Structure 1
């Protein structure tokens, strides 16, 4: 496939509904050799089983909250991939409290802190830690959301961390381009996954999206997986520091509901 010969680290898989899951399957379908991380004890099992199904037996622990855990992970991966071709960063978090109701009243200094640490800093931390291990031709990929560009009810502080993340995308691309690494993000339309069902009227929001989105449907993890597979391959050699909208054109339209 267009990814044969590449070695890519996929973080973030948590269920077959996960975006990273759709991204893994698509990169494997195109021939990439895959590696995986899991956050904690609760997820190791799920991730080993999916990794097995996609031909991989590289399943390593990584909590991006901790610098030591990122370094350790890259040390283990190094025994198997002295070098590789990039990773998909598909991680995000904000303390429950942060994403519901009036933004000014919900946010707290801690909430803000954690949300940015886990969703934005964690992307350049992973890069820092594996930098020398990357081949020229490598590609870094993170996942963002429209909340970073416009204020969306309930997304609250996550919008601030996503904005920080896209800017990180730009500064990471400008810093690493000289050594041969590209860095981009996919701004995905809303998809019902684990990380969502626990907040607001996500179901009513999806109905609204399907209605006003130009392609008249919400996007799927297969859609994201395909663009992701592409952003992480040599077919996108001319793209870097870009935030690509894979939301069916939702964001480029206005007042369609009327």
Structure 2
């Protein structure tokens, strides 16, 4: 099977919960040594400990991905712990609906968090992936990068930039043996709150979801494993939308 990550070393950011946590655990089961990072150090550590107790190799670190010193520390930690970097999953991000008249600090922060952080981490990881014989970068984007709605000036525009960055930097790092792809997830039921996801909003989301259920973090992690494995060795510059056939407003 080509769907393994044998001898890989994967950095997974923002991974104390949700999609990032599922990606970290799945990648470790598939053979990768995993560097789990999160804004809360205790949460990254809990994921890494669970991986180790299940028979895998992992460490957990605090990382504010918007801080250059934190970014450099994560790169160094991966090299100090496992000797190389071959996979980078840029899952850290955030934001959401905001009014058109938002303060410019809010608009700029969407870009610092969703885009500048993962571009810089990609810059820092790429020389190490080339030295290791090749690698894969995976960006977790959002369906907002392709869809259009109210209150999306910062969130939608920053995620659109993530999508197009993915397509373009594939040309820059392909000759170094590095693939770059993105996943745009639909609405995920994992870690969603029952008060935020009460049956009337769930019914309204499922009305435009052909497959009749909301997503799970493991769905995204399965697609992430595919895109970071030799099974996707000739796939680069792609944005894969995982959303059950539809959209969830």
TM-score range, shorter chain: 0.7 to 0.9
CA contact (8 A) 1:211 1:217 kept: no
- Which SS does the other structure have where 2:83 is aligned? coil
The residue that corresponds to 1:255 in the other structure is: none
Q: In structure 2, do the counterparts of structure 1 residues 49 and 83 end up closer, same or farther at CA, with 3 Å as the change threshold?
A: closer
Aligned counterparts of 1:206 and 1:157: Cα–Cα separation in 2: 25
Q: Is it true that 1:4 corresponds to 2:1 in the alignment?
A: no
TM-score where L is the length of structure 2: 0.86
The residue that corresponds to 2:241 in the other structure is: 245
The residue that corresponds to 1:24 in the other structure is: 24
Which of the residues 201, 208, 212 maps onto 1:212? 208
Q: Is it true that 1:160 corresponds to 2:157 in the alignment?
A: yes
The residue that corresponds to 1:109 in the other structure is: 104
Query: 1:57 deviation in Å?
Result: 4.1
Q: Is it true that 1:151 corresponds to 2:144 in the alignment?
A: no
Matches of residues 36-185 of structure 1 in structure 2 within 5 Å? Answer: 36-41=36-41, 43-54=43-54, 55-94=56-95, 99-100=97-98, 103-105=99-101, 107-134=102-129, 135-185=132-182
For structure 1, the residue ranges without an aligned partner over 5 or more in a row are 252-258
- Which SS does the other structure have where 1:212 is aligned? coil
CA contact (8 A) 2:134 2:176 kept: no
Aligned counterparts of 2:23 and 2:165: Cα–Cα separation in 1: 21
Q: Is it true that 1:33 corresponds to 2:33 in the alignment?
A: yes
Query: 1:84 deviation in Å?
Result: 2.2
Aligned counterparts of 1:222 and 1:123: Cα–Cα separation in 2: 22
The residue that corresponds to 1:233 in the other structure is: 229
Aligned counterparts of 2:58 and 2:8: Cα–Cα separation in 1: 16
Aligned counterparts of 2:49 and 2:41: Cα–Cα separation in 1: 14
Aligned counterparts of 1:46 and 1:142: Cα–Cα separation in 2: 23
Greater than 4 Å deviation, 4+ residue runs: 153-156, 200-205
For structure 2, the residue ranges without an aligned partner over 5 or more in a row are none
Q: In structure 2, do the counterparts of structure 1 residues 57 and 216 end up closer, same or farther at CA, with 3 Å as the change threshold?
A: closer
Aligned counterparts of 1:143 and 1:130: Cα–Cα separation in 2: 17
- Which SS does the other structure have where 1:159 is aligned? helix
Query: 1:93 deviation in Å?
Result: 2.2
Alignment RMSD (CA, Å): 2.4
Q: In structure 2, do the counterparts of structure 1 residues 181 and 74 end up closer, same or farther at CA, with 3 Å as the change threshold?
A: same
Aligned length: 241
Q: Larger deviation: 226-235 or 35-44? A: 35-44
Aligned counterparts of 2:175 and 2:114: Cα–Cα separation in 1: 25
Aligned counterparts of 1:183 and 1:139: Cα–Cα separation in 2: 6
